[PDB]
Amino acid sequence: TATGVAITGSAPAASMDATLPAQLPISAASVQSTFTLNLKEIEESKEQVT
Amino acid sequence: PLVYTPAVRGGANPASGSYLLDPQYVNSGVDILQATYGYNINGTANADQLLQRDAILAILEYALKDTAFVNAIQAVAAGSGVTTPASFVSACVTKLT
Amino acid sequence: PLVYTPAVRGGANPASGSYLLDPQYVNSGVDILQATYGYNINGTANADQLLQRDAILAILEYALKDTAFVNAIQAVAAGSGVTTPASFVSACVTKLT
Amino acid sequence: PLVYTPAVRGGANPASGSYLLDPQYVNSGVDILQATYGYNINGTANADQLLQRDAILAILEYALKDTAFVNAIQAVAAGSGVTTPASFVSACVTKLT
């Protein structure tokens, strides 16, 4: 603050700024995907697709 | 029955174990906590202490930030006989039960 | 009337205003808390927030560590009309008044 | 309750889901089908669509091959008003119920 006092005044009260945090968290979750493919499906599709 | 999740948005159950609280502004917007909450360090949680951890986190996020709970815990501290503050916590346990 | 000095051994009123709470073991000796408490950040406390700050520390230095207060705030959450944890604090205000 | 197995001998539940039907000779004479049957391609079969799959494979294996079912479905098509065969199937669903 910057207030106006008299010329013979008495030095008004103090003030400062303030700095604040944000804290923005990540370790909770994760996006994922699965397949479940066989071992014989991979074999007969190496000769039956163009 | 209190259903509850940790109130920070994307950091609800931490994989590190150290649940870090977001800073809430207590005492009617004059002060600031900036707490954390470390999980299990002296054992496990044995299916009852999940309910006690359910109320420690709720009283530390939704209560101290509130302005009607702090004016109700103030009037207990200005009663009679409540000095040497193991009596303040024991005059508060008779009200709640 | 509650009159006390904060329970840390040599750091009651710091010069910086960043009062660091001692680490305490709250969930019946399972979970660690590790808070701080930054002082006046939106002006001074005008002798009414100076009384509420005397009470917020008392629920934080002493009460969450105690094993009889946490059982009382456990049984409030097991009421038949307490869900949605902003009505959890309105269910313990009425006990404290 | 229907008890049923896929009619081709060594190929009942295939790995890839492409259940190749064995060819049947359908018109009691002169034709052949050589169908297949792909399994779950637009989801899964959720415990009721197994029963519909239990009856589609029975009407496709043991019914089109028969000579008294193809004569029973012949006489419905020579009925009254059974034209534009989206109504042939709707005049057959009234007989089955």
Q: Which of B9, B14, B23 is facing A27, going by the closest CB pair?
A: B14
Any A CB within 8 A of B13 CB:
yes
Phi-psi bin for D28: left (phi > 0), alpha (psi -120 to 50), beta? left
In DSSP terms, B18 is beta-bridged to B38
CA dihedral C67→C73→C77→C82, nearest 10 degrees, is 180
Are C26 and C64 spatial neighbours (Cβ–Cβ below 8 Å)? Answer: yes
Identity of the residue in B41, B54, B79 whose CB atom sits nearest the CB atom of C32:
B41
The CA-based angle C2-C4-C5, given to 5 degrees, is 160
Residue type at D22 in one-letter notation: D
Cα angle for residues C72, C78, C79 (degrees, 5° grid): 100
> Counting one residue from A and one from B, how many pairs have CB atoms under 8 Å apart?
27
Q: What residues of A are in contact with residue D15 (Cβ under 8 Å)?
A: 38, 40-41, 44
Count of CB atoms situated within 10 Å of the CB of B62: 19
Three-state SS for B51-93 is HHHHHHHHHHHCCCCCCCCHHHHHHHHCCCCCCCCCCHHHHHH
Count CB atoms within 10 A of the CB of residue D57: 17
| A to B contact (≥3 Cβ pairs closer than 8 Å) | yes
In whole angstroms, give the CA distance from residue B65 to residue A7: 43
Contact B6, B13 (CB under 8 A): yes
> Could you tell me the resolution of this structure in angstroms?
3.5
Q: Are C54 and C4 spatial neighbours (Cβ–Cβ below 8 Å)? A: yes
The nearest CA of chain D is from the CA of A28 a distance in Å of: 30
Q: Which residues of B touch A27 (CB under 8 A)?
A: 11, 14-16
Q: Rounded CA gap, C27 and B50, in Å?
A: 9
Distance, in Å, from the CA atom of D83 to the CA atom of A39, rounded to the nearest integer, reads 50
Closest CB to B38 among C31, C80, C89: C31
Strands B18-20 and B36-38: antiparallel
How far apart are the C-alpha atoms of D16 and D37, rounded to whole Å? 11
As for chain C, the residues directly before each break of C–N over 2.5 Å are none
The reply to whether residue B42 touches residue C51, judged by beta carbons under 8 angstroms, is no
> B32 pairs with which residues across the strands?
C38
Tell me the three state secondary structure of residue A23: coil
A5-to-A1, A8, A9, A16, C6 alpha-carbon distances in Å: 12, 8, 6, 19, 39
Are B43 and C42 in contact, with CB atoms under 8 Å apart? no
Residue type for C46, please? Answer: N
Kindly list the residues from chain A whose CB atom is less than 8 angstroms away from the CB atom of residue B9.
25
Distance of CA D74 to the CA centre of its chain: 16
- The angle formed by the CA atoms of residues B72, B78 and B81, to the nearest 5 degrees, is 120
Nearest to C34 by CA among C26, C23, C45, C43: C23
Residue from D86, C57, A34, C10 nearest B70 by CA: C57
**Parallel, antiparallel, or unpaired: how do β-strands C18-20 and C36-38 relate?**
antiparallel
What does the alpha-carbon distance between residue D49 and residue D52 come to, in Å, rounded to a whole number?
5
Residue of A2, A23, A40, A28 lying closest to B21 (CA atoms): A23
Give the closest residue to B34 by CA, choosing from B47, B24, B45, B42.
B24
C-alpha angle B22-B24-B29 in degrees, rounded to nearest 5: 160
Identify whether the C-beta of residue C8 lies closer than 8 Å to the C-beta of residue B85: no
Neighbouring subunits of C (3+ Cβ pairs under 8 A): B
In DSSP notation, chain C reads ------SSSS-SS-SSSEEEPPP-B-SSSS-B---EEE--SSS--TTTHHHHHHHHTHIIIIITT-TTHHHHHHHHHTSTT--TTTSSHHHHHTT--
Elucidation method: cryo-EM
Backbone torsion region of residue B4, taken as left when φ is above 0, otherwise alpha when ψ lies between -120 and 50, otherwise beta = beta
